[PDB]
Amino acid sequence: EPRTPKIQVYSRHPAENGKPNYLNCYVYGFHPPQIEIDLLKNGQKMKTEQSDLSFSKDWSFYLLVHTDFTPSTVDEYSCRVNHSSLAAPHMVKWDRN
């Protein structure tokens, strides 16, 4: 029985347009552990770094994916997750608010 991932997309620091920042996607609570995660800019895959896969009795499996980014007034950023508990990949949009 799979357990569906939960997905948090956030910037390391409060967003200001045109200032460099870090974009993060934390996904957790899932089983089985095989999972695919990307960060997207306007629907296109960004180059990212991905933490070590880890397990906790309180969180099941969890992973953090992150990259540099510079928010603007028009550019959209999202996290895309594919996992066997899902019928198709899910995307969560970064919301600066």
Residue numbers in the entry: 1 to 97
What text appears in the publication on this structure?
We also determined the structure of monomer bat β2m without MHC I. And the key residues binding to α1α2 domains and α3 domain of the Ptal-N*01:01 heavy chain are highly conserved in human and bat β2m.
In this study, we screened bat MHC I Ptal-N*01:01–binding peptides from different bat-borne viruses (HeV, EBOV, MERS-CoV, and H17N10) and determined the structures of bat MHC class I complexed with these viral peptides. The overall structures of Ptal-N*01:01 display the common characteristics of classical MHC I molecules in other mammals, with the extracellular region of the heavy chain folding into three different domains.
